[PDB]
Design a protein around this ligand. Structure first.
Ligand SMILES: CCOC(=O)c1c(CN(C)C)n(-c2ccccc2)c2cc(Br)c(O)cc12
Lengths: 231, 218, 242, 213
């Protein structure tokens, strides 16, 4: 069983991805911010670990541990949902740094860390979860938008570098995903499919990318937003 | 015949052939079309029980309508439609290129629209051409057109997507140096993309271009 | 007395930053440019004459940024054209990209943009006039290896610009990005030739660009002739990326 | 003076574009669908422009007009091409023919003169937003890129300009107001000049923040 590591697995999009990767035949390590969260994950499967994506030493702890115990990480899903929206005039340095750290830096550190296993193995999937706001301006989301756009760019670069070693690096960019009724309808009017998304939709795409069926897809953003944004 | 019907234009060889074979494993009844009767006869032989080969020249509108009607009568509504593949040139050559690559897609999409609207399910997938050994006009045209169709067909729960191959093995090779994964694709790689798009796992993906080129272009 | 509007151009010593600063002068802005050293700043003064002023600034340091903007308002006027420009790189394959290679590049490019942007808004919201032009790069969209940190920073700049353009619209402040491609620079001058040609093969126009090309683009957006363009990316790459 | 051809110059955006190109210093030939319309254009241009009748439907008119321009005024070095559902094939054929077929023919026709002078600008303006992924607009934008790659070798630039709301609609716009024809003419004048020599294959959006790409 190739092992797959899914950060932010406790709920929503992350939970759906970890479950789906189980069904796909992967042994799945899901992580959560606190130890309450990691044990549930242990239960939902039958391995969860607590990880703060902001800390380098924790990241080194978890990955080093997994390679000893289960096997080298061969599918890495970087998923994070935390937001700290504010208009720029009201957005603090801490508000900026936190979101940049949790979304973008974490992708750099974990992607850097797993390369070794993937390179030896002749096989690798790094799948980064971005968002449609990387491309759609929404106010109060300066920090979140920038982080997600940075992840997509990062993925393209990393895809060039590691392609020789048969490792694919892609981003999946969810649209309006479910998780005020008027706010909901205004979001819906924009989507061509005329509805909001569900985490299963993202899990389905990540599963595809994670499989042998997507061995020739790399350096791409796969959009899953029902026509909200086309490109 | 019980299964949902998928129609794959130009299913004779390579990518077309591979797409149609996959859609069959996926559980669709597949009608693969070739330009000539001899070509369609071959398809019928190879699909066997779970398909049929029909002759179609995608250029003629009456032939387009005749073929879908024949399918509608014999097999069932067309729920999946896969349209398989220098401007300083003659005007005729250009018009021919856009009749085949763009007008046809428009015609077949309009033609099958009703059946998909009724079932409230539909897949339209357009395969752009293989890269020669980026900003090609046919590809660009086709991808811009998929986005627009997708905007219109969306309310009815129909997805329109294109799939862009890079270098795929035809026959043949340092073109592969240009590819990040460092090799040429296989037709099956495009087949796998189409199958994911064609299935119930891709219900919220539309207006998109799914690139299958190993990082040739990003 | 000085009666021109003030433009601040960060990283104006050489290449693209230099050309931008020289051109905005010709456009009739009073241009303050920055350099990484006091000696670098001096040269800018000896170049901007009585039409501009040089200042030393390490864009990674917040206090230093607050001090410089404060000093501009104190000696020259509010900053109504902000051009965030930075050329510094720290290339490496992710295998050998350290934490500091990452942090430092993200701080110089993306962070600086956030900090300087934020510090000049109110001074722009007051005069109801405003231009923030953020220099991006084509490697934000054009996969390039060994530049993961620089590509992420630049792509982030573009998205940040879109988001701010939305919040600052009511106030008549435009926020755009300009994204140069393969521009002949001091750094591009150092490379081999079959490789510079390798770069040019990819460009549709079949040549490398000039800093003046980027200066021309920024002057246009900075001027009264682009008052209805905001939240966009202006690509100046000769067809490298379409 | 270098010659600029501006189709559909009779009113609004096309009119503003022709006037700005004159100020910039080009000799401007504006086209109108009928002969009186062309005469009107001629009157308004003073002695620095001319008006010709051209119904862009007919390719045959394009040969006569460009030839007419070549013989009387000079070679065309700047060419501005000015401006959708389930409807009959015919409506589609007509829109495409105006928005895309005419452009192709015009672009092909001025290509040798631009090629010989080592200078060229083709600038395609898409239609205003009504009242995004509209087919004519998407098509024209896609077409401009393809033309850009092919024509780049000859130092000819091909770009697109995409207006938003040009004179609530205003509430959707970031700058909170409608644009003016002059907004488009300014963008066009920039691209048409020696300032924009390294810009090709792009779409210059001038929508006040309506859409951000
Ligand atoms: C069948 C509808 O599409 C077209 O007829 C053409 C398109 C595709 N666009 C609309 C997305 N294109 C097109 C082709 C390549 C790139 C962009 C647009 C056309 C170009 C010319 Br010229 C023409 O006469 C017709 C079409």
């Amino acid at each position: 069983r190739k092992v797959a590591l899914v950060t932010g697995a406790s709920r929503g999009i992350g939970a759906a991805i970890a479950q789906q990767l189980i069904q796909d035949g992967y042994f799945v390590v899901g992580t959560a911010t606190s130890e309450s969260g990691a044990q549930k994950l242990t239960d939902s499967f039958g391995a969860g670990l607590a990880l703060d994506v902001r800390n380098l030493d924790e990241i080194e702890a978890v990955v080093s541990h997994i390679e000893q115990n289960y096997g080298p990480v061969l599918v890495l899903v970087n998923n994070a949902g935390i937001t700290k929206d504010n208009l720029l005039l009201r957005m603090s340095e801490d508000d900026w740094d936190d979101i940049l750290n949790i979304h973008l830096k974490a992708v750099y550190r974990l992607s850097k860390r797993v390369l070794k296993g993937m390179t030896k193995a002749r096989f690798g999937r790094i799948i980064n979860i971005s968002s449609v706001v990387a491309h759609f301006a929404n106010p109060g989301q300066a920090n979140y938008s920038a982080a997600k756009a940075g992840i997509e760019a990062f993925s393209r670069s990393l895809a060039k570098e590691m392609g020789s070693r048969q490792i694919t690096v892609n981003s999946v960019a969810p649209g309006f995903i479910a998780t005020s009724e008027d706010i909901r309808k205004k979001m819906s009017d924009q989507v061509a499919l005329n509805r909001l998304g569900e985490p299963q939709d993202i899990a389905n795409a990540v599963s595809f990318l994670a499989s042998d069926k997507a061995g020739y897809i790399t350096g791409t953003v796969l959009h899953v937003n029902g026509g909200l944004y086309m490109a």
